[PDB]
Design a protein around this motif. Structure first.
Motif, PDB file in Angstrom:
ATOM      1  N   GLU C  77      -6.155  -2.118   2.087  1.00  0.00           N
ATOM      2  CA  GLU C  77      -4.767  -2.121   1.552  1.00  0.00           C
ATOM      3  C   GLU C  77      -4.266  -0.600   1.758  1.00  0.00           C
ATOM      4  O   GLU C  77      -3.481  -0.491   2.484  1.00  0.00           O
ATOM      5  N   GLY C  81      -2.182   0.888   5.036  1.00  0.00           N
ATOM      6  CA  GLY C  81      -0.742   1.904   4.741  1.00  0.00           C
ATOM      7  C   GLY C  81      -1.005   3.003   5.556  1.00  0.00           C
ATOM      8  O   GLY C  81       0.076   3.534   6.427  1.00  0.00           O
ATOM      9  N   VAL C 139      -2.395   3.310  -0.389  1.00  0.00           N
ATOM     10  CA  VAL C 139      -3.186   3.192  -1.585  1.00  0.00           C
ATOM     11  C   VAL C 139      -3.515   1.833  -1.987  1.00  0.00           C
ATOM     12  O   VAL C 139      -2.834   0.765  -1.327  1.00  0.00           O
TER      13      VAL C 139
ATOM     14  N   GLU E 134       0.529  -1.523  -9.395  1.00  0.00           N
ATOM     15  CA  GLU E 134       1.289  -0.295  -9.106  1.00  0.00           C
ATOM     16  C   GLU E 134       1.439  -0.194  -7.473  1.00  0.00           C
ATOM     17  O   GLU E 134       0.521  -0.743  -6.953  1.00  0.00           O
ATOM     18  N   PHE E 136       2.776   2.067  -3.926  1.00  0.00           N
ATOM     19  CA  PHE E 136       3.380   3.528  -3.510  1.00  0.00           C
ATOM     20  C   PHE E 136       3.595   3.057  -1.991  1.00  0.00           C
ATOM     21  O   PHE E 136       3.223   2.285  -1.290  1.00  0.00           O
TER      22      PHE E 136
END
Ligand SMILES: NC(Cc1cnc[nH]1)C(=O)Nc1ccc2ccccc2c1
Ligand SMILES: NC(Cc1cnc[nH]1)C(=O)Nc1ccc2ccccc2c1
Ligand SMILES: NC(Cc1cnc[nH]1)C(=O)Nc1ccc2ccccc2c1
Lengths: 144, 143, 144, 144, 143, 143
Positions: C77, C81, C139, E134, E136
């Motif tokens: 993941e 990104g 992240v 969470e 980002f």
């Protein structure tokens, strides 16, 4: 029964049990079949393997370009699916084992508008983590 | 050899009598949801799948975690059935979408490694000609 | 203070100042830490570097597959990104310098449902134009 | 007539007929021109070929980084388009023949806010099937 | 060494007292916008960011150019926070999104090379359990 | 040498007097549709193109097959004009989009190999400054 070339195409692909009889029932019903395997996810490598294994089986006549062109587009859609997205990150000379099935004939209905052709792919892509493999799947239906 | 993805597709196409297949897999440890929606609109499909998914125990009525995996498995499969154009699936009128969800362990280890697969079989028809094209999609995510 | 593993994970990653003390404060608070670097954006190369640097530090026990599997998904993941999109065009044996941070522990709340694990990546990708580099960031939070 | 740098840029690119006169009419109208070709779709390879062919022609002064930076972004947008999507699957050391055009000047209007610059690309990508090639096209307009 | 992207994230997480950080960077040449939206719907986020962005001088009230860079920086960052599924961000109920925008020169050269970065920190909660995940995201574009 | 894609773009930019170009290509075997929409919203553009496309015989009033190719050619071209952000095209106010559709055989063979190309030229303006940016897109699909 149903003359759904796509459905048939996938079931044929997804059954490692007596393709011998599952194929004959299709051939007996006007369908032209053809199966195989490829250790490459590379477009070139896959459309080559398929175009080949298909002409030799009679799924498509190599007489020209039209029937070969219909197969390519079908294969690309099916491949465009195998290379989903998380398979866009997974690209480090990894290990892939795709198995396929190609069906050619007439999803009859009432009108014989012509002949269709399905190309379904199912395989595995190794993960960079031992003991983990992702399943891939793609189908491409096209009109000859 | 325990292909959640492969299993879900088969359940989807085998119109034999899933009633056996569902209980055969339900007793084999899996969670199963089988449904049909008359649209290929991303939002509609998710909602349906989501409803049928909870109402069947394939996912707990609450909890972001499991819902996120369903949604993604579903979104990955929707890209298959709308042939690479999510937006145009919304545009398709007169279309049938059958779906199958399967949640369970992919291997036999104790390690939960709980996974969920959404399999979609689309039939794009015509008020006249009937079936004009078929579409397939699959989504496999860990929980 | 906050027991937000993701937030913590990123701050740790983004501070080239006394990771020595910033790490100890985390370790002192039940968190298992681990940092490093990789000059590759290649999935295989990155999940390898990370799985490794993480087992040696105690972030995850190499005892089996479960904890290693949770780390992989988290890393993907985070990588999914870093390889944003304009980083899908940038793929010509370019230069990349990724730095990471891995946190493992319990975003407590009230319930100890288990243990989480964050993997944040920050680096630079050289541009085919001298004097130009793009910043990357990803992240991945997962539940052990 | 229109001082549309993008429109002009594409027409120049798309006309294999007397670029000699089509170029002079542009140069005569305050525009700085520059054309060429590249057998690579690789970002590095393309932004290199272009940055080069452009400095030598006066489309941009190599004096620093600013004007070179404006060209890169313009080229990337145009490339980001050439590598559409079905050109994300087509990646097997295939054959590509991109031709380009670069225009630099002032899409005047009423205000001389500065100078713009267009980079349009047109080429062909060979298919893994003989007798089949896909057309590519991308444009990138940027403000110097 | 002048990382607009890195700077924006830090501003986003450092809940110390940004009041100093904002004026410390504002006097250092940057433009700063700090906000919060209760949705991860693409349209809603953009509108908010856009409003807070102009109302703060981070971008001129009019002009396609600057607006396009904000939008893109924002869209690139939204792909981070919705974990690769823009559409499902619209679907998330009970969620908080804090955002930070930074517009300025990345290097010290005279060459304007004006850049803008949007940093997003998402908190997907639950009416009960509270924080469950969470997210980002970051967007860095030249103007 | 019979570039449907290249041909459609030229038709799009050549504001000379397409009236000749359209009949010159119409008699050369192609199908042609030329239009303009005041939006870069995916749905709006498709609908317009779709209407103008049928009303011109570039596509039969019914039949999933041809409609799917138009839609895709159109979607591929829309990604060009909205500069890689479909969603933000919906957000652009005060914008002009001219489109050109071309359906026909790419080579001279008997093999129908019927193809369709959608070419888009976008002009993003400002209530004041006028033209502020131009955008191009192209879609080429087989039928
Ligand atoms: N599972 C399918 C397709 C399918 C299944 N049944 C019918 N079609 C797939 O991979 N489809 C795709 C994916 C990307 C595509 C991109 C461009 C054009 C067609 C595309 C088709
Ligand atoms: N910045 C983040 C993620 C994140 C940040 N905080 C939580 N999650 C990122 O790269 N996410 C992504 C991107 C593509 C993805 C594709 C498939 C699944 C998850 C994905 C997650
Ligand atoms: N035909 C055009 C662009 C264009 C044409 N006229 C203006 N702009 C193209 O390839 N655009 C793109 C594509 C992806 C992109 C991704 C990120 C940023 C800009 C991008 C621009």
């Amino acid at each position: 029964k149903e003359r759904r070339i796509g459905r048939l195409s996938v079931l044929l692909l997804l059954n490692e049990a007596e393709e011998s009889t599952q194929v004959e029932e299709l051939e007996r019903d006007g369908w032209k079949v053809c199966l195989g395997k490829v250790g490459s996810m590379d477009a070139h490598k896959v459309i080559a393997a398929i175009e080949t294994a298909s002409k030799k089986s009679g799924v498509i006549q190599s007489e020209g370009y039209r029937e070969s062109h219909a197969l390519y587009h079908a294969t690309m859609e099916a491949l465009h699916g195998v290379t989903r997205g998380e398979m866009l990150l997974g690209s480090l000379l990894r290990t892939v084992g795709l198995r396929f099935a190609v069906l050619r004939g007439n999803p009859y209905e009432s009108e014989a508008e012509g002949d269709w052709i399905a190309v379904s792919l199912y395989g595995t892509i190794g993960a960079p983590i031992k003991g983990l493999e992702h399943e891939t799947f793609g189908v491409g239906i096209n009109h000859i």
